[PDB]
Design a binder for these strands. Structure first.
Lengths: 351, 351
RNA sequence: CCCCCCC
RNA sequence: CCCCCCC
RNA sequence: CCCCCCC
C-alpha cells in the first residue's frame, strides 16, 4: 500500500508556478507618483492633513502613498507596479502656485485641506501664546510616517472585514499613536483609516507598493521612532490571512492529546503537505494574503475539517481564540479539545 | 515465478508518449481573439452582460474567453491554441461605431446586449436617487472575472453531465458569488452557465486556453478578490474526472481492513502501477480529463473491479460518496466495506 | 472559494 | 508597536 | 470506452 500516494497540493503549486505566460491587467489605467525631489513638500501635505479637522478625508491614503513614492523614487515605484503583475502607467506629479498637482487627486481637495490647516494654525497662534513646540507643527518630518502608521494599522486588517478593520484601527491607534495624538489633538483616525482601506481595496497593486516600503524601511540602518513603529506594525501584519497555520503550530507546541485521534492522524499527512508548501514558497509566503496573491488559498487548511476543529478547540481553551469568527466543522472535537486545553492551562506543572 | 511479469500500463503509456507524428485537427477553422489594447473596452462588455436581464445569452462564454485573450495577449493565445494540438487560426478583433466586432459573434447580439444594459441603466438612474456605488456599475474591473467565475464553476463540472453541471453551478454560485449577486441583482447564472458549457463542449481547445488563464492568474503576485476566487475554483477543478484515485488514497488513509482481502491484494499490483503512471506524468496529470486529453483513460481504475468496489464502499461508509453515480462492480465487498467504514466513523478512538 | 481574534 | 535598572 | 458527489 506504499505506492497508493497522490501528492495533489505539490502538483497544484507546480502547475501554478511553472507558467510561461504573464497575466495582463489594468492596461488602460494610470496612477500618480511623486519624485523624491518633492519630498520636503509632500511631508508638509502629509502633516497638513493631521492637525486640522477636515470635512473630507477622501485622498489621505493617496497622500501617504505619495510619500512612499518619494521615499522609494518614481522609477522604483513604476518598476514595482510593473513587476506586481499590473501594467498601470505612473503619471508624475507637478507643482503650481506652492502646492502639488497630484494625478487623480482634485486640486480643490488639496486646496481645501491646506486652507483648513492654515486657518487652524492661525487660530492656534492668535489665541495661544505663540509657543508652538518643534513637534506640533505640520512641517514635522515624522508626520508622513504617522499617516502611513494609520495606513499600516488598517493594513494589518485587510484579511478581516471593513467594520472590524476600522474598529481595530481606532482602538489600536488610540494607544499605539498616543504620542502623535498628544502632539496633534485633532486627528481623525476613523476617516483616515476609511480612506486607506478604500485605497487598498480599489488599487491592489498599492499593497505591493506598501509592502516594498516596509522592506525599504526595515532594511535601513537608522530611523526615527515613527519609522520604527511603522516597521513594528508592518511585521505584525506578516502572517495575515493565515492564522490557522499559526494556531496549528501553537497546538503542536501545546502537545494536545487529541492530535492523536484517528481522523486527525488521517489528515496530518496533507496538513504536513501544506506546511511543506509553506516552506517551499519560503519568506514571501506570509505576504500572500496581504498582496491578495491568487496563489494564496493553496495554504488553506479548509480541506482538513477535523484538524481545523481540533486546532480551533485548542486555541479556544488557551484563550487565544478571542472572538475569532471562523467556522468549526466538527463540534465534538472542538469541545473536547477546548476542555483539554483549559485543563492544561489551569494546571501548573514544572519540570 | 518472479519472471512472469508483464507491465502493460507502462507499455501503453510508452507507446502513447513516444510518437514522432503530430495530429492535425480543425485545419480549416478559425476563432476570435481580442488584443490587450482593447481590454478596457472588453471589460465593459463583460460587465454589460451582468446587470441587465437579456433574452439571449448565447455568446457570453465567448466574451469571457475574449477577456482571457486580452489578459494573455493575442500572440500567446494563438501559440497556446497551436500547441494544444489544434490548428485553429486566430482572427483578430476590430472596433466600429464605440463597440467591438468579434469574429463569430453577430453584431446584432452585441448591440442588443448593449442596448438592453443602457436601458436598464437609464431606468435605475431615473427612478433611483442617482447614488450608484463604485462596485455596481458595469465598468467595474472585476466584472470580467465574475463572468469567468461562472465559467469556472461550470468548468469544474465538465466531467459530469450537463444537467448536473448546471444545477451545481447555480447552487454554488448563489453562495460563492453572493457579493456579485448583491452588486448585480439581475444576473442569470443558469443561462451564462449554459453558454459556457456549450463553448467548452464545442471548442475543446478553449479548455486549454482556459487552463492557461488559471496558470497565468495563479502565478501573479497580486490580484483582486474576484481573481483569487477564480483561482480557488480553478484549483478545485484540478482532480476532475479522477475522483476514483482520490477516494482510493482516502481509503488507504482510512486503513480499511478489506484492503487485505485476496482479490484486492491481487489487483493492488496494477493499482500501484496506475498510481506510478500518475507520478510519471506528474503535475499535468490532473488536467488530463479537464482538457479531454485522449491520454486520459490510462488512469482509469475500471480494470480493477474489486478494488473499485472496496474504495466506493469505504467512501459510502465515510459519507464522502454523497450522490455519486458510478458503478459498483462487486456488491458484496461494497456493502461490507461500507459497513466497516460506518463502524470506524462512529467509534471515536484517540491515540 | 478563501479570510475573519489580540498586540 | 518596541524600549525602560546599575556601572 | 471513460467520467459521474460536496466545497
Amino acid at each position: 500500500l506504499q505506492g497508493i500516494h497522490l501528492s495533489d497540493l505539490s502538483y497544484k503549486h507546480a502547475i501554478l508556478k511553472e507558467s510561461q505566460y504573464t497575466i495582463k491587467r489594468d492596461v488602460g489605467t494610470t496612477t500618480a507618483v511623486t519624485p523624491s525631489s518633492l519630498q520636503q513638500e509632500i511631508t508638509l501635505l502629509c502633516g497638513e492633513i493631521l492637525y486640522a479637522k477636515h470635512a473630507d478625508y477622501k485622498y489621505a491614503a493617496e497622500i501617504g502613498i505619495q510619500y512612499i513614492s518619494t521615499a522609494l523614487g518614481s522609477e522604483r515605484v513604476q518598476q514595482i507596479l510593473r513587476n506586481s503583475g499590473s501594467e498601470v502607467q505612473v503619471v508624475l506629479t507637478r507643482t503650481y502656485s506652492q502646492m502639488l498637482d497630484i494625478h487623480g487627486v482634485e486640486k480643490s481637495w488639496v486646496e481645501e485641506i491646506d486652507k483648513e490647516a492654515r486657518k487652524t494654525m492661525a487660530t492656534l497662534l492668535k489665541e495661544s501664546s505663540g509657543n508652538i513646540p518643534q513637534n506640533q507643527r505640520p512641517s514635522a518630518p515624522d508626520t508622513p510616517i504617522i499617516l502611513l502608521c494609520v495606513g499600516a494599522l488598517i493594513f494589518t486588517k485587510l484579511a478581516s472585514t471593513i467594520e472590524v478593520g476600522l474598529e481595530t484601527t481606532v482602538r489600536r491607534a488610540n494607544r499605539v499613536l498616543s504620542d502623535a495624538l498628544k502632539r496633534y489633538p485633532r486627528m481623525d483616525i476613523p476617516k483616515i483609516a476609511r480612506s486607506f482601506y478604500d485605497l487598498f481595496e480599489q488599487k491592489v497593486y498599492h499593497r505591493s507598493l506598501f509592502i516594498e516600503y516596509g522592506k525599504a524601511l526595515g532594511s535601513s540602518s537608522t530611523g526615527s521612532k515613527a519609522e520604527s513603529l511603522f516597521v513594528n506594525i508592518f511585521m505584525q501584519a506578516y502572517g495575515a490571512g493565515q492564522t490557522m497555520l499559526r494556531w496549528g503550530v501553537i497546538a503542536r507546541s501545546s502537545n494536545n492529546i487529541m492530535l492523536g485521534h484517528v481522523s486527525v492522524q488521517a489528515e496530518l499527512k496533507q496538513v504536513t503537505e501544506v506546511y511543506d508548501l509553506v516552506r517551499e514558497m519560503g519568506p514571501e509566503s506570509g505576504l500572500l494574503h496581504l498582496r491578495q496573491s491568487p496563489k494564496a488559498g493553496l495554504l488553506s487548511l479548509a480541506n482538513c475539517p477535523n484538524f481545523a476543529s481540533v486546532v480551533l478547540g485548542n486555541a479556544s481553551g488557551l484563550g487565544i481564540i478571542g472572538m475569532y469568527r471562523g467556522r468549526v466543522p466538527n463540534t465534538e472535537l472542538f469541545s473536547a479539545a477546548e476542555s483539554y486545553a483549559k485543563s492544561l492551562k489551569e494546571s501548573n506543572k514544572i519540570n
